[PDB]
Structure formats: C-alpha cells, structure tokens
DNA sequence: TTTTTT
C-alpha cells in the first residue's frame, strides 16, 4: 500500500492520539497531553515525532499537504472514546506527573498512563525540591508568624494545614472553608503563595456563584471551575448595611457535588466536573437566608489573629481585641512572592503536609461552633426530646407540669412552651430565632387549640 | 464502469447507513448505532468496512479523497428515510442489545434490526452479570439499610423498587417522583448507583426546567434530555423564604407528554421524544402556583427515613422525629461507588425487579396523599357534592337547614355557608384556600342575592 | 440588554 497509510498506522500505534467523550483530541507531546478546541494539534503532533520513524519516512513529513493527509487518516481510523482524569492522587506538571504517595517524579511513558488532561503550567525541578535550602527557612519563618506554633492555636494550624495540602487532590469534596480575619493578616499572602505554588490549577472567580441562579442563561464563571483543584472567591461585603444579597444555600448544597450545572456562552454543554476546594475570603461573619441541619454540615472556618503593623500605628493595634500578636512588616515580600521565589519550598511542605492526613483517606469535616449564627440551633439539639411512646407512661409527673395527653401522645401548648424556652434564651437578642422556630412546628388541632410536640430534657429527669 | 461507483452500491447494499427522520446519517459500526453532526461517520464506516470487500477493491479505499468520492456516492443514493427507535423492552449496549423480557443478549446482526440511536457507552459482560457474587451479598446489605424489609415500610419499598425499575424502559411516563427525606437518608446515593448502573442514559438538568419558560428562545436544558431515559432534578431551595420562585403548574403537564418543545443553540430543530423518567431529590416538600385535579395525577413521593451519621452525633440523631433508625457511616462506599464496582449487579437487580412489575403493561400511579397541600382539595370532594335534579323532592327537610331554591335550584346562599364549613377546618390555617375557593365558585343571582351549587352530605342523613 | 446570530 501508500506509504502515508503506513505512517498514520505506525502513528497510532503509538497511543499518542487519543479522542474523549466531550468530543476533542487529545496529542501526546513535549511529555504532556495537550488539546485545543480551534486548533488541530494532530500536525504538531506527526512534524514532532518524525524522528522516531525510520529514516525513509521522514523526508515526506516536511510537507503540509502529506501532513494533512496523514491527519484525515489518523482521524478516519480513530473511531473510539476513553475516559480522562481518574486518578485523584497525581500531580501534572508541563514535563511529568509526580507521585502524591510517595514522592517519586515520573516522565515519558510512566508518565503517559495517566490521562491528565490539565498541568501547573511550569516545569518541575528537582534541584529545588529539598528541604534544606536557605528558602526555606525563611518560609517557615513567614508560616510561623502568621499561624504560630502555641498550645492556644494548635486546632486552628491543624485545620490551616489540612486546607491547603486538600489542594493537591483531584477529587470531589463536601465542604467549603472560609478565612475569617480582620485588615492586614495575612490572607492575601497565603492566596498568592498558593497560586504561585499551584499554577494553572488555580483560580479565582465571582461573588455571583454564592448569590445568583447559576442555570439562567450563560455563565462564565461556572464554566471556567471545570476540573479546577483550587478556588477562591474574596472580599464579600458587610451584610448589615441595607440593599445586600444574602448567601442561598441550596448554591452551598449544589457547589458541593461531584457535577455542577452550567453553561458557558455559545455553548451546549452542560455538565462540569468539580474538583476543586472553595476557598472564601472575608472580613465579617457570612449571613444566610436559610438555616437547616443540611447547611451546617458543609461549613468550616479558619481563624487569622496577627497583625502586620507600620511603626506609626502599632500602639493603636495593641489595643484591639482582635489581634493576638503584632509585627512589623516587610516591604519587599511581595515582590519576591511574585517573583516566585518560595514556589518549590511550599509545594515541598503542601506535599509533606499531604502525607500527614489525605494517606489513608481524603475528608473535610465542619466546625458548626465557629459561626455565631448558628448558636440557635445548636443548644436546640440539647434541650428538646420529639414526642415517642415511651414518655407516655410517666405521664404521671408531666400533667404536674403542664403536660396533655392527646391522640395518646405527650404535647406542651405553644402558649405553654414560649416562656418554658424564654427562660434559656435572651429574648430581646434571640427575639426572631424564637418566632421562627416555633412557626415551622406548630400544630393546630382546632381554631382553639395549641399544641406542640416536644420535651424537655430536664423535665424528663427524676427529681 | 466507474469502480467508485460499484464500490458506493456494494457498502449501501449491506444496509450498513441509514437516513433519518430528522435528516441525520446513522452507521452501523462496531456492532452499534452511530451517528455525530461534526464528525465523518461514513468515512469512518467506509475504511472499517474494506475488508469485507474484494481484494481490488480494498486498495481504493486507502486514499481519503476517493473516500470521500464514495462518500458523495452514497448520499447521492439515500432518498428515503426511516424511523427509529420503535422497541420499548430493549436496553442497549456499545456491543449489542439485551433482551429485558427473556433475558437473552444479541450481537451482530441479530441486534442490529432493532434501530437504536443510544446506548450505555460501556460494553456488556456476562461474567459479572450473576446472582452469586461477593458484590451482590454487598450491594444487598446497602439497599436494605436504605430502605428497611419492615412491614410499616413495605409499600414505599415497592414504590421505591418501581420507579428505579421504570429506568430501563424506552416509553412515555406519565407522573413525575419526588425522592423526599431529611440530610444523611442515602438519597444521592442512589443516584450514584444508577448513574454507574446506565451510564449514558443517565442525564442531570437544571431546576430552569419547572420555573422558568421552555419555550423562550434557546434552551440546552431542555433539548440535552431527548431520548433519554432518565432525568435528574436536584436541590429545589426552600420556598418559605422570600424571593423563592414556585413551580409552575403548566411545565409539569408538558414534561408528561410524549414531545417537548425546545430548541438547542444553532438549531432549527424544536421536537424532543419523551422516554425518561424525572426524579427530583428533595430536602423540602414542593410548591406550586395552582391546584387543580390534573395536578393531582402526575406526582408521586418516596421516603427516605434511615439516618447515616458519625458516633459523635449519633446522640442527637436518636432524639430526632423525622428518622426511624440510625447507623453507622461508611466513608469508604463513595470511592467504590465512583470505581463502578457495583455496576453490573445492580443491572442485574434492575432487571430481576422489571421483570416483577411492568411484564404485562408498564404504568405508574400518584400518590396525592403524601402532599400536604392536596389535603384541602381532597377533603372537599368528600363532604360537599353538586346539586342535582334528584334533590328536589327532598328539599322538604332542606328547607329546616337554611337550604333556599333559586332558579329551582338548590341553592345556600353565601351568609350561612361560613358557619356549616368551619365545623370541619380551622379558619387561621385555612384561610387562604377557602377564600380563594369561595371567590372562584361564587355566584350572585341579583345585587344583593348570593348562592352557591353544593350540598353537604350529612345534610341529606337525617339526623 | 444580550446572547443570539452571521
Ligand atoms: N511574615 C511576615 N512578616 C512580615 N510582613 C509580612 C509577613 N506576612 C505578610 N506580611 C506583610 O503584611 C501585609 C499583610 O497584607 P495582606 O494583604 O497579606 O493582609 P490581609 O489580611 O490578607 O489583607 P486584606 O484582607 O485587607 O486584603 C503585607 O504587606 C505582607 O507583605
Ligand atoms: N448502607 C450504608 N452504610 C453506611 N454508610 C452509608 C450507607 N449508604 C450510604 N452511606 C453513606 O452515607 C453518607 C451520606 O449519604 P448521602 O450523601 O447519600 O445522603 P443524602 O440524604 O442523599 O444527602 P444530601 O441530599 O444532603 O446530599 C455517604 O457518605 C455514604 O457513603
Ligand atoms: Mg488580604
Ligand atoms: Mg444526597
């Protein structure tokens, strides 16, 4: 047969070419896979590897017209799909994929088995990967002012540190983390260190994916999260002035599954895949519209109390309740940040610290006792009992109390019930959390009678 | 003779490309149905299909133009066209087509009469398609935990193993399912285990789709569901809160019939068959605009009452109305889920529960008596019916219960009507639904005279 | 208004 056949056969081969459900093709060069929706990559592809055919070969790969022929073959033979981006514990970069497990780089075929189909962007080196460098030090001193190594903040490093190495993970996960803290702490640093550690898998989008419809018409913002490992959203505004949107919370329960829905401009498609940790920056306590135990499982919170101060103002933040520690500052960090100077020294820790937790299993858990809103809620849970049969027969002690036995069951009156919980709680400070619990379990048997199903837990008690 | 000519005849003679109604080219390739408006299918088909040729003829075919020579042949010869996808009881695969009523699997040309455009995109496997495996004394254990064999929970279990059954068909369902239960029941996954159980058949859409217009212009949420056989809707947000949109009436009318109106981007096409059945998982009950009786036959509800938590909360958990029974988490069963080890004996569980319930016909039926806003509608039509001829002679006694005939009619005017209803319905929780149902049936004979066309059963018992 | 469409 025609040489050009035999080219495009010898090409694929090789397993460098390869098409994706999503309906783009993916080519195997410079030990990265690459695509591009506009460009047909293929060429690049078969001028690039024309050095491994034999000799006779690849003289006719100097023309374009043979190129494009060779390429209509490779895409008449090439019919099939395969899945991308299955193995959550590895690493891309623009020359390998490193090893999450146990810290092995691995280039050319080793690296060719897993599809990742997204990079840092920037080549790895391993002569800056090590532990001892005179960076390093000067790293760990930075980490150590903002998060200091006391008894009193042993919890909140441990939750600091478990965040960022999450960043590593190409999985889905259940919980989004807000960075709590006041002016001049330490929050940008820590966002532009991770960019600069991370590359391409960062990004940082809108307010509007915590206040807006995310399925009506296009939506950029959502698109652009596709198979992210990183996301930061920042500077939300004081709630308490009037006109402000407050945070939806079924946009909290979508943002947590494994697709979102969504939809770029001029697009059909539909469906994105989620992978990364949500991160958002602020300065005063969220404000949600609707509170339910669904919502408080997917919360955490990260505190920040050190104050980087000039000469000037120091006396005046040593008299703020809202700072632990003052120190001065230094100018020129952020320029040596954005020189990415201690790029390598933190991917180095984030990896150490990924070894510690993320080992056996990957998982973010809540801190519901961090947000002052959901006090309320909480101390319910450890006061009141629902109603079931095996109050009914110490009856004898809550009809002493203001108990009644209707429809065979143990009830209090709304009336009853309002004072019994007004001695727990502040009224004039819990005035609208106690209207709007009793609302939503009110039961009415008639116009005249009251009723709700509920016991206290002291009450139950032998005296 | 032309060659190409006798070529193009041969490969249309073997009935291997085929036109559709919808202007769409569909090839037989790799013992499945295929067919993409981007990509050249029948070039594609034309190389694959060389072997079968002549030995003189088989080198023609490696050059691409003389391919597509072939190819202008072929659509030269295609002038009619043909319908698809007619057989409700096949489920299709990316290597042939499995009989749901004897059991039997077809490949090759056995499976290649019954036209179909879909399949599940993973290639079927007997071995594990058994009874007697490891994964399904597993998978057993998960289902029953979800959903207990308890004599209370008999009917929702049925109702449950139903709908989920009602995934394999390729026909029109006529009612809608809400999959209701509080945080932590195993609602998602469920959703997971179909997912991993019919690949692409399985498709998520937007919450646009019961509160906005389908019919406005373009709308990829709506046209991305056409054929398919199962539709996702998840995390409806609470319609208490103020601002919340409620669903409307009219959308759910249209998703039951058998076309839907919408048009995709670049697209002039607007017909979309309807063969999925729509789940809606849910933390709150819905709402809608309007109640009416054609509301009331297309909604069905399932419930989900076993709690999954953590051995911290699990104190709570057991003091809590809305569980029945609580259990330790697994947090190794999302890892295994997403590896699709419990694909093939889930198929298989499917198929065993399609068999018990839809072998003679297939249909699904409402169950209006878990929404608690239907209750008003449905009580009505007990106690009050439509005055008719045959109670004219028994007026006699009508006349002592402030009965008036009007126009001979019986007739009780609207001054006593309040009294005789609020023996039955408490005025505070009430009040909205007898207003509007007193405005939409009153009828004034004169300025001044008022009456209404219903009768009170226990008024025609003597008492 | 703007994606839509050209
Ligand atoms: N370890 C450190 N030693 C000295 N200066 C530091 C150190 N870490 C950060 N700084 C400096 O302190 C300042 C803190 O600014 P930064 O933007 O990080 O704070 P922030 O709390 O995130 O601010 P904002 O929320 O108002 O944007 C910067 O000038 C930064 O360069
Ligand atoms: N049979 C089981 N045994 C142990 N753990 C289980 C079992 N079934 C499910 N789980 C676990 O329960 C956890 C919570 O379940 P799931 O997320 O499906 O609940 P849900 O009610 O659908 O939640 P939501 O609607 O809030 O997303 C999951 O992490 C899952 O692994
Ligand atoms: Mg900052
Ligand atoms: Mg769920």
């Keep these: 047969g025609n040489k050009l056949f035999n080219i495009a056969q010898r090409i694929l081969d090789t397993n460098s070419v390869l098409l994706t459900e999503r309906g783009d093709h993916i080519v195997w060069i410079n030990n990265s896979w690459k695509f591009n929706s506009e460009e047909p990559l293929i060429t690049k592809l078969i001028l690039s590897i024309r050095h491994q ?4 070969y690849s003289s006719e790969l100097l023309c374009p017209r043979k190129r494009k022929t060779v390429e209509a073959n490779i895409r008449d033979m090439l019919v099939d799909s395969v899945e991308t981006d299955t193995y959550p514990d590895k690493l891309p970069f623009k020359n390998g994929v490193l090893d999450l497990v146990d810290g092995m780089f691995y280039s050319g075929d080793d690296a060719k088995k897993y599809t990742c189909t997204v990079s840092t962007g920037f080549k790895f080196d391993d002569t800056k990967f090590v532990e001892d460098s005179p960076e390093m030090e000067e790293l760990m001193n930075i980490i150590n002012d903002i998060q200091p190594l006391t008894d009193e903040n042993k919890k909140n490093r441990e939750l600091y540190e478990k965040t960022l190495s999450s960043c590593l993970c190409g999985a889905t996960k259940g919980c989004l983390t807000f960075f709590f803290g006041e002016t001049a702490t330490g929050k940008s640093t820590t966002k532009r260190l991770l960019k600069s550690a991370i590359g391409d898998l960062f990004v940082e989008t809108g307010q509007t994916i915590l206040t807006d419809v995310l399925d009506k018409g296009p939506n950029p913002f959502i698109a652009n999260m596709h198979l992210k490992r990183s996301v930061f959203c920042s500077e939300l505004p004081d709630f308490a002035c009037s006109g402000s949107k407050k945070i939806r ?13 969504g939809r770029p401009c001029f697009s059909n498609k539909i469906n994105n895949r989620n992978h990364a940790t949500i991160i958002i920056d602020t300065n005063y306590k969220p404000v949600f519209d609707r509170i339910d135990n669904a919502l408080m499982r997917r919360i955490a919170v990260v ?3 050190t104050h980087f101060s000039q000469p000037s103002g120091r006396e005046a933040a040593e008299n703020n309740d809202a700072y632990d520690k003052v120190k001065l500052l230094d100018e020129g960090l952020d320029g040596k940040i954005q020189n990415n100077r201690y790029r390598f020294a933190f991917l180095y820790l984030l990896v150490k610290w990924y070894k510690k937790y993320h080992i056996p299993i990957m998982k973010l858990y809540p801190t519901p006792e961090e947000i002052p809103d959901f006090a309320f809620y909480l101390k319910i849970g450890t006061l009141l009992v629902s109603s079931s049969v095996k109050h009914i027969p110490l009856m004898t002690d809550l009809s002493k109390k203001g108990y009644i036995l209707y429809d065979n069951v143990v009830t209090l009156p709304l009336t009853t019930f309002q004072q019994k919980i007004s001695k727990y709680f502040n009224s004039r400070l819990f005035g609208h959390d106690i209207e709007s619990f009793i609302n939503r379990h009110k039961k009415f048997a008639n116009v005249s009678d009251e009723y709700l199903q509920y016991i206290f837990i002291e009450d139950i ?3």
Excluded: G, W
């Design 303 to 305: 505190r920040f109390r």
């Design 461 to 463: 008690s032998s005296p």
């Design 249 to 261: 919370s079924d946009n909290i329960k979508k943002l947590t599954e494994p697709c979102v829905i």
């Design 53 to 56: 055919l034999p000799k006779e």
